[PDB]
Design a protein around this ligand. Structure first.
Ligand SMILES: [Ca+2]
Ligand SMILES: [Ca+2]
Ligand SMILES: [Ca+2]
Length: 354
């Protein structure tokens, strides 16, 4: 996420933070609900942290801990995990590792945690959805990205070269060779609770949020974040994708949850106002779509044309191509519902017009 950048929530004051600005220091935990503990790991990106969750649990008579998400494979996060093992687990083992999705800050240390950390203290199973596991395996093991961004309006030969000669493998250095499949609707028994798998689309293949309906707690992964937008992007591998339509449809899964649901997001702070935040995200994308409509009404626009309208800030070449993926997702939503016509110019650039 070094070149990743996000849209900040100016309506944060409409959410409620039950712990205010309290946050667990590195290597320590903070109880956010009975048997649910919050870990905060540093990240070296603009997004400077990820929240991970430790759930008190008992499987087959053995008391211990279920981990949700892992961090990137950095020396600093590994050291913080080791401190946690030694001082914050009450001397009890990890029983299993659940990963919400394959992005590196969530999947990176799965293999290392499954195999017991530096001292190999246990040997446990990774639980994850099939789509996230398989894409993780594909990416864990370029020139296609450059052809992609070129046909969407990036024409500077020097910039295209910087993409050609290009991360995931350094942050996710191994992915477990075995997994336990999570599927939408699965009931997980974790400690005193049943957590249900709520799958989400448009951000990643098959994103797993975990919902404890009786106590009203939601582990939202990256699908609902209080301070930032969720990345929704069209990529070279699925060049006609409609991820924004999938994402906006997916947000309906949370609008039927309780209005007082405690949301545990992967970035930001635990919060209430789930429905408020969903409304803010819907409003945000409606405003971005209106800008795309307005621009395409006056001339055929490429994704590169849309970036400086959608992102009112300076971007380097790497941030530009990341923004281009999100611009293209908004173009594709309008295109595929019949509001734009897609034309590949004789210059090879794909553009969209009213
Ligand atoms: Ca993600
Ligand atoms: Ca191994
Ligand atoms: Ca994330």
């Amino acid at each position: 996420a070094h070149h990743h950048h996000h849209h900040m929530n100016a309506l944060e004051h409409q959410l409620d933070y039950p712990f205010a600005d309290g946050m667990p220091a590195a290597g320590t935990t903070q109880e956010v609900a009975p048997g649910v503990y919050w870990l905060r790991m540093p990240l070296p990106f603009a997004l400077d942290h990820i929240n991970l969750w430790l759930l008190r649990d008992e499987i087959d008579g053995q008391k211990g801990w279920t981990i949700v998400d892992c961090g990137i494979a950095s020396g600093e996060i590994k050291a913080n995990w080791e401190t946690v093992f030694d001082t914050a687990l009450e001397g009890l083992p990890v029983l299993r590792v659940i990963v919400t999705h394959c992005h590196p800050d969530h999947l990176g240390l799965a293999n290392w945690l499954c195999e017991g950390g530096d001292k190999k203290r246990w040997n446990v199973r990774l639980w994850i959805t099939l789509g996230e596991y398989m894409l993780g395996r594909v990416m864990a093991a370029g020139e296609g990205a450059a052809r992609h961004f070129a046909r969407h309006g990036l024409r500077d030969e020097a910039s295209l070269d910087k993409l050609r000669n290009r991360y995931y493998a350094d942050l996710v250095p191994a992915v477990p060779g075995q997994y336990r499949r999570l599927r939408d609707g699965d009931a997980l028994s974790i400690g005193a609770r049943t957590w249900r798998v709520v799958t989400g689309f448009g951000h990643s293949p098959e994103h797993c949020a975990l919902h404890a309906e009786a106590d009203g707690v939601l582990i939202s992964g990256d699908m609902v974040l209080p301070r930032i937008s969720t990345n929704v992007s069209v990529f070279d591998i699925e060049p006609e994708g409609n991820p924004l339509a999938l994402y906006l449809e997916s947000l309906g899964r949370y609008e039927t949850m309780a209005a007082d649901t405690l949301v545990l997001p992967s970035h930001g702070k635990p919060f209430r106002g789930l429905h408020t935040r969903i409304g803010q995200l819907r409003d945000h994308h409606a405003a971005r779509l209106a800008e795309v409509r307005a621009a395409c009404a006056d001339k055929p626009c490429s994704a590169a044309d849309i970036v400086p309208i959608m992102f009112r800030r300076a971007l380097d070449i790497h941030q530009m191509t990341f923004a281009m993926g999100e611009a293209l997702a908004h173009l594709h939503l309008l295109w595929l519902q019949g509001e734009l016509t897609r034309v590949q110019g004789e210059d090879g650039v794909i553009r969209f017009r009213a």
